[PDB]
Amino acid sequence: FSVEFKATENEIVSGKLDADTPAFHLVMSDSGEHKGWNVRPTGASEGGQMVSADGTRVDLHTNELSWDNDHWWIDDGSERVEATFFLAAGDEVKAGEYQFTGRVEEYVPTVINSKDISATKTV
Ligand SMILES: OC[C@H]1O[C@@H](O)[C@H](O)[C@@H](O)[C@H]1O
């Protein structure tokens, strides 16, 4: 069981986005038998937002995972799942360094593995 979560390399400049803009990339893997994964936002990120130091909250979205009220999830039994979190076109993105904190969970439902994730994306 390993997890990789990091900010993307594309530069974001403040203002009103025209397009879906990549912000973080996630990799969740385990050779063990499993049903799927949760990605649960934690702390300030509750609600599924990245949050800057001045308290600006920006929505995260992904096309690789589903969403259930307050968390991403997917049924995927393969050894490895990748996801990109992006900012939707049309959102205004203001000042600073935006942190997302979360907890990744592997389930079979019973959770059999869990790990904190954290990364900071610059605007
Ligand atoms: O099948 C199990 C899955 O069911 C979904 O409805 C739920 O949002 C996921 O977190 C996971 O528990």
Side-chain angles (χ1 to χ4, degrees):
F1 166 64
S2 66
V3 182
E4 305 147 48
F5 183 69
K6 65 165 57 180
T8 50
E9 317 214 27
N10 60 287
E11 194 178 68
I12 315 185
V13 179
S14 65
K16 161 119 179 161
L17 311 163
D18 310 284
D20 298 334
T21 300
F24 300 102
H25 185 265
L26 171 68
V27 181
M28 298 174 289
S29 61
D30 185 29
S31 53
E33 158 179 340
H34 64 285
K35 187 188 177 180
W37 309 87
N38 293 319
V39 183
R40 299 190 177 277
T42 61
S45 287
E46 284 204 14
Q49 282 83 44
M50 49 165 87
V51 190
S52 65
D54 69 18
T56 305
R57 305 179 66 82
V58 176
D59 292 339
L60 286 187
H61 307 274
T62 175
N63 293 315
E64 296 77 46
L65 306 175
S66 306
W67 174 267
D68 184 5
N69 277 320
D70 55 19
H71 70 280
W72 297 277
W73 69 279
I74 187 175
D75 289 341
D76 184 315
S78 71
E79 179 266 340
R80 192 186 184 272
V81 179
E82 278 188 15
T84 293
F85 294 89
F86 64 89
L87 315 180
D91 286 12
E92 181 81 2
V93 56
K94 289 201 58 106
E97 311 294 338
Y98 289 86
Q99 180 168 61
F100 179 84
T101 64
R103 185 174 70 262
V104 169
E105 299 173 337
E106 189 188 6
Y107 59 78
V108 300
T110 302
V111 174
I112 63 171
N113 269 313
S114 294
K115 193 187 299 286
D116 269 348
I117 55 176
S118 176
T120 289
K121 179 54 167 186
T122 303
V123 178

